[PDB]
Scaffold this active site. Structure first.
Site, short mmCIF file in Angstrom:
data_model
loop_
_atom_site.label_atom_id
_atom_site.label_comp_id
_atom_site.label_asym_id
_atom_site.label_seq_id
_atom_site.Cartn_x
_atom_site.Cartn_y
_atom_site.Cartn_z
N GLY A 13 0.78 -1.22 0.00
CA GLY A 13 0.00 0.00 0.00
C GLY A 13 0.81 1.27 0.00
N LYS A 16 3.21 1.31 -4.90
CA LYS A 16 4.16 0.75 -5.85
C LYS A 16 3.57 0.83 -7.23
CE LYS A 16 4.50 -3.23 -4.09
NZ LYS A 16 3.48 -2.93 -3.02
N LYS A 38 3.62 -7.82 -13.73
CA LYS A 38 3.18 -8.20 -12.39
C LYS A 38 2.95 -9.71 -12.38
CE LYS A 38 0.85 -7.11 -8.31
NZ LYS A 38 1.03 -6.04 -7.29
N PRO A 39 3.97 -10.51 -12.05
CA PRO A 39 3.87 -11.99 -12.13
C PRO A 39 2.68 -12.62 -11.42
CG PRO A 39 6.05 -11.33 -11.44
CD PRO A 39 5.20 -10.10 -11.36
N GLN A 41 -0.73 -11.74 -8.96
CA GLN A 41 -1.72 -10.79 -8.47
C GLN A 41 -2.69 -11.46 -7.49
OE1 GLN A 41 -2.72 -7.32 -9.89
NE2 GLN A 41 -3.76 -7.47 -7.90
N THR A 42 -2.88 -10.85 -6.31
CA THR A 42 -3.86 -11.32 -5.35
C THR A 42 -5.01 -10.33 -5.22
OG1 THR A 42 -3.19 -10.31 -3.29
CG2 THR A 42 -1.95 -12.26 -4.04
N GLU A 109 6.65 -5.24 -11.01
CA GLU A 109 6.00 -5.00 -9.73
C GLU A 109 5.79 -6.32 -9.00
OE1 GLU A 109 2.09 -3.64 -7.17
OE2 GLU A 109 2.18 -2.93 -9.24
N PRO A 198 2.07 13.15 -5.79
CA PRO A 198 1.02 13.74 -4.97
C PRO A 198 0.02 12.68 -4.54
CG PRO A 198 1.53 15.21 -6.77
CD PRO A 198 2.36 13.97 -6.99
N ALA A 201 -3.13 10.83 -6.75
CA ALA A 201 -2.92 10.78 -8.19
C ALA A 201 -3.63 9.61 -8.86
CB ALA A 201 -1.42 10.74 -8.48
N1 CTP Z 1 0.46 9.13 -5.29
C1 CTP Z 1 -0.49 8.09 -4.93
C2 CTP Z 1 -0.08 6.81 -4.29
C3 CTP Z 1 -1.06 5.75 -3.91
N2 CTP Z 1 -2.46 5.96 -4.20
C4 CTP Z 1 -3.45 5.07 -3.85
O1 CTP Z 1 -3.08 4.45 -2.47
C5 CTP Z 1 -3.21 3.15 -2.54
C6 CTP Z 1 -1.87 2.46 -2.45
O2 CTP Z 1 -1.27 2.55 -3.72
P1 CTP Z 1 -0.92 1.15 -4.54
O3 CTP Z 1 0.04 1.51 -5.67
O4 CTP Z 1 -2.20 0.39 -4.91
O5 CTP Z 1 -0.23 0.08 -3.49
P2 CTP Z 1 1.13 -0.80 -3.76
O6 CTP Z 1 2.35 -0.12 -3.18
O7 CTP Z 1 1.33 -1.28 -5.17
O8 CTP Z 1 0.85 -2.02 -2.72
P3 CTP Z 1 0.20 -3.43 -3.21
O9 CTP Z 1 0.47 -3.80 -4.67
O10 CTP Z 1 0.93 -4.47 -2.37
O11 CTP Z 1 -1.28 -3.30 -2.95
C7 CTP Z 1 -3.93 2.82 -3.96
O12 CTP Z 1 -5.30 2.49 -3.66
C8 CTP Z 1 -3.77 3.88 -4.76
O13 CTP Z 1 -5.06 4.16 -5.42
C9 CTP Z 1 -2.84 7.25 -4.83
O14 CTP Z 1 -3.97 7.45 -5.06
N3 CTP Z 1 -1.86 8.32 -5.21
MG MG Z 2 0.23 -2.84 -6.17
#
Ligand code: CTP
Ligand code: MG
Ligand code: CTP
Ligand code: MG
Lengths: 226, 227
Positions: A13, A16, A38-39, A41-42, A109, A198, A201
């Site tokens: 979260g 990434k 992304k090998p 996905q859960t 990822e 930001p 985003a």
């Molecule tokens: N600058 C950013 C960073 C994150 N998010 C939001 O915050 C959450 C976390 O981002 P995400 O990329 O989904 O998590 P990952 O680091 O990829 O973690 P994972 O794949 O293990 O869920 C998401 O719902 C995403 O919509 C956002 O809106 N704007």
């Molecule tokens: Mg993710």
């Protein structure tokens, strides 16, 4: 070959996926060809699908995956619950090396942090990054605790001679706040901060997301990637 | 000397203070003498006092602090914001060694997670652990992400040959969801899980907290901490 970058994070979260999308959008705007893998996905029952997010936000079409587990759990847990093994190490490494080509930035990822289990038997994104000679881009938060988690991740990176390409703050709050502002400087004392995306985003449309991404990374670094 | 355990964690807020108190309580009820030490303490302007909380839950009276910063930040940041400096490594180690004594279990709670800076330059609770030859008891969560954090921490511990005394799940929800239960098994496969303290334990008074504490740990492991 071209450039393979693994995009890992200090936890789950941390954004990434949005960082993958942002870097992709920037690199594409530099006229670089991007693929994202992304090998595993859960969380698929509730519509978790990080490659789809990259497609929507950045317009990447080379989006490659091997397995989808319904449960919103850690991959090995989702596998156990679903009754099926994880992919093999070979499947992952070879899918990635087959995406890679000259002129292409290939982002990979993982799921969650660096040491979570990605394939059988107990192989991690760190191992994968070793097998394909990729550097690691570490997605971090600006929140209390990010320093400890970052130093831990960079140490694990170095322990297997995986290079660190830099840090990205996945979500920069507005207004920042005292802790987040202090952390951004501290973070800049241990590795190159490449961008801070930001907060929120992930909700932009593709035009605005592309604009954000264009302004978030150093253009010379992005170009300099491939 | 005696036995020194650093009580570290996979991050901030994982239950280090409550584990110090619970293990202190169980060792006290085993007739073992316990000192608890908190060398770098932040958030004092918000009333954060981990030593006082160990004393309140466990009745430990042998509480030792050293540095106190008002803001609830990383120690480096709290020090920069107060106009103060961080302690030196040997000041922290000195504080711990003065508590050590045969028959005594001396718990040393850090600031946040294992690699937080406690002293200039970039001195961590891991360096301190090597200095005082302590083992590390690592406090972890049951939440998603905890396996990664735990493995990272153990890897950082073994990097300097600091022995792992086991893990303690700081907060164990009742009932445990699918994620909690699964993580508990995986953690049990990574390292010895020494106890899993029930969530909300800080709301129990002296007798309930002492009952929970004695039941939490293996009696033989607690007794085996000190000869
Ligand atoms: N600058 C950013 C960073 C994150 N998010 C939001 O915050 C959450 C976390 O981002 P995400 O990329 O989904 O998590 P990952 O680091 O990829 O973690 P994972 O794949 O293990 O869920 C998401 O719902 C995403 O919509 C956002 O809106 N704007
Ligand atoms: Mg993710
Ligand atoms: N089994 C537990 C563990 C924690 N808490 C509560 O959860 C919070 C965090 O526990 P704590 O021990 O204070 O976390 P620490 O690791 O000590 O965080 P830090 O040292 O960085 O302040 C506290 O409010 C505490 O009262 C609880 O009620 N029962
Ligand atoms: Mg504490």
């Amino acid at each position: 070959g071209g450039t393979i970058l693994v995009v890992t994070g200090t936890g789950t979260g941390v954004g990434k996926t949005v960082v993958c999308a942002a870097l992709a959008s920037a690199a594409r705007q530099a006229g670089i060809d991007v693929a994202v893998c992304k090998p595993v996905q859960t969380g698929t029952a509730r519509g978790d699908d990080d490659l789809a997010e990259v497609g929507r936000l950045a317009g990447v079409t080379q989006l490659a995956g091997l397995a989808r587990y319904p449960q919103p759990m850690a991959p090995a847990a989702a596998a156990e619950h679903a009754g099926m093994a994880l992919p093999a190490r070979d499947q992952i490494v070879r899918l990635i090396a087959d995406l890679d080509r000259p002129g292409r930035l290939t982002l990979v990822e993982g799921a969650g942090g660096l040491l979570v289990e990605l394939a059988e038997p107990g192989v991690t994104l760190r191992d994968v990054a070793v097998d394909v000679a990729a550097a690691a881009l570490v997605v971090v938060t600006a929140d209390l605790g990010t320093l400890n988690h970052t130093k831990l991740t960079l140490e694990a990176l170095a322990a297997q001679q995986v290079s660190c390409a830099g840090l990205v703050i996945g979500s920069w709050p507005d207004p920042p706040g005292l802790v987040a502002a202090s952390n951004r400087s501290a973070l800049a004392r241990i590795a190159m901060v490449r961008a801070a995306l930001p907060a929120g985003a992930a909700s932009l449309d593709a035009g605005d997301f592309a604009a954000m991404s264009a302004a978030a990374f150093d253009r010379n670094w992005v170009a300099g990637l491939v």
